[PDB]
């Protein structure tokens, strides 16, 4: 057909297209923030020196808990994205008129 | 596709949206007493502070 | 879905919903013609023929 308003499945396109890469810096903040999160359990664990042998089991248990949190954090912040794929509300503060 | 009902009635999915521009209004209906909230507010103060 | 730009059925389906009602009187005017083209038959067996 010829075409006689503008299409919205461009619009939609490009969209998407450009979505889907903030994948990245996500999961680039996630793995920051663990490292963080070891670093300070490892300053607090400074004041147990009397104690060998109970200084490395709290690091060893807060430590392991803390790296097997991630996958489920990983997969909440995939989630969140597919989320933003899914539909594509126009009705928000957006160019209405236009 | 073709084949619409132009002048009958909105159906199928059509509905659905009227639920998601409906929900704003089920978001509003939630009323609270403006006293309520401040005697929360001031409770809420004193018990953060404490002694 | 939500509606940013207008679509091209909203034209497209109001327009062959109103080109199917030309069916009708186009049916008439052919009945009217072969009405006229069978009068005037008659008339000339009727003037001629004996």
Do not use: W
């Not at chain 1, 619009?11 to 999961?27: D, G, H, S, Y």
């Not at chain 2, 909105?10 to 209004?25: K, L, M, T, V, W």
């Amino acid at each position: 057909r010829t075409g006689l308003f503008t299409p919205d499945m461009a619009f939609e396109t490009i969209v998407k297209k450009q979505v889907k890469k903030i994948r990245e810096p996500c999961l680039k903040c996630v793995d920051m923030v663990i490292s963080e999160l070891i670093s300070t359990v490892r300053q607090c664990t400074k004041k147990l020196q009397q104690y060998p042998r109970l200084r490395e089991e709290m690091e060893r248990i807060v430590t392991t808990h803390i790296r097997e949190r991630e996958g489920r954090t990983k997969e909440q912040v995939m989630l969140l994205i597919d989320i933003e794929l899914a539909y594509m509300n126009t009705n928000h503060e957006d160019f209405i008129g236009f | 596709g073709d084949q619409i009902d132009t002048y009958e009635l909105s159906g199928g999915a059509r509905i659905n949206r009227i639920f998601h521009e409906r929900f704003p209004f089920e978001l509003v209906k939630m009323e609270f007493d403006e006293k309520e909230l401040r005697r929360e507010i001031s409770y809420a103060i004193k018990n953060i502070h404490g002694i």
